[PDB]
Amino acid sequence: PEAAALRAELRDLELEEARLVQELEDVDRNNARAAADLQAAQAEAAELDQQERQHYRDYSALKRQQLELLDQLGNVENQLQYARVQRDRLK
Amino acid sequence: AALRAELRDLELEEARLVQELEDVDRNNARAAADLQAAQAEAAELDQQERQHYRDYSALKRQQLELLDQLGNVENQLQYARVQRDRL
C-alpha cells in the first residue's frame, strides 16, 4: 500500500509532465514562428537598406553638382564685378 | 568697348549657370523626396522587426518558466521512482 500511494502519485505526476510538455510545444511553436517572422523582417529591412543607401548616394551626387555650379557662378560673378568696376570708371 | 563685349559674355554665362542650377535643384528635390520615402519605410520595417523580436523574447521567457516547472516535476518523478523501486 506504500507502493499503493506511489503508483498514484506517479500517475498524477506523469500527467502533470505531459500537460507541461503540451504547453511547451505550443510555446516552442510560437517561438519558432516569431523567429521566422523576425528573420523575414530583417531580410526585408536589408534589401531596403540597400535601396535607401542608393538613394542617399544619388541625392548626395546631385548636391555636389549644385555646389559646383554655385562655385562656377561665383567665379563668373567675380569677373563680372571686376568688369563692372572697369565700366564704371569710364564714367 | 571690349568691356561691353566682356560684360555681355559674362552676364550670359551667369544666365546659363542659373538655368542649370534650376534644373539641378528640381532633380535634387525629387531625390530628397525618394530618400525620405525610403527612410520612412525603413522606420516602419524597424518597428515591425521590433514587434517580432519582443514577441520572441517574451515567448522565450515563457518557455524558460515552463522548463523550470518541468524540471521540478521530473525531480518528483525520479524521487517517486527511487522509492518505488526500493519496493
UniProtKB/Swiss-Prot annotation, chain A:
Name of the protein: Beclin-2
Residues of the full protein shown: 158 to 247 of 431
Domain of life: Eukaryota
Keyword Coiled coil: yes
Similarity-based family: Belongs to the beclin family.
Known function: Involved in 2 distinct lysosomal degradation pathways: acts as a regulator of autophagy and as a regulator of G-protein coupled receptors turnover. Regulates degradation in lysosomes of a variety of G-protein coupled receptors via its interaction with GPRASP1/GASP1.
UniProt KW keywords: Autophagy, Coiled coil, Cytoplasm
GO molecular function, one term: protein-containing complex binding
Encoding gene, per UniProt annotation: BECN2
One GO CC term, this protein: phosphatidylinositol 3-kinase complex, class III, type II
Annotated stretches, region: Required for homodimer formation: 17-87
Assembly description: Homodimer (via coiled-coil domain). Interacts (via coiled-coil domain) with ATG14 (via coiled-coil domain); this interaction is tighter than BECN2 self-association. Interacts with AMBRA1, UVRAG and PIK3C3/VPS34; these interactions are not disrupted by starvation. Does not interact with RUBCN. Interacts (via N-terminus) with GPRASP1/GASP1; the interaction is direct.
Tissues in which the protein is found: Present in fetal and adult brain (at protein level).
GO biological process: autophagosome assembly; autophagy; cellular response to nitrogen starvation; endosome to lysosome transport; G protein-coupled receptor catabolic process; glucose homeostasis; late endosome to vacuole transport; mitophagy
Ranges in coiled-coil conformation: 2-91
Organism taxonomic ancestry: Eukaryota, Metazoa, Chordata, Craniata, Vertebrata
Species annotation: Homo sapiens (Human)
Subcellular location per the Swiss-Prot or TrEMBL entry: Cytoplasm
